[PDB]
């Protein structure tokens, strides 16, 4: 229980859709959940209804574990991961919106 914040600091990106995502601040060996169960707070939803979606440049949607690293890039030319919505169907899918305005 509890986990201080000192050294090895560095953050997970978790794009939600194409041109959003989340900034989690994660250890350099932080589990892909420590993201999750942050992401979904940070989009409002059930970490464990969400699941990691590491995608690839070429353009290929990819699924892991919740303890899966987040940062861990062993052999890969930049990468970013996703969340997306655990359905009642075997895929995933991204998002649309699901969301209100701010500010103005």
Known sequence: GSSGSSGEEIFCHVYITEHSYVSVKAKVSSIAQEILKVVAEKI???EE????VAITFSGE???????????????EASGRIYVYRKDLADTLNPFAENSGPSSG
């Open 61 to 75: 949607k990819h699924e892991l574990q919740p303890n899966d690293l987040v940062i861990s890039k062993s052999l």
């Open 44 to 46: 409002q939803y059930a």
């Open 49 to 52: 209804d969400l699941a990691l």
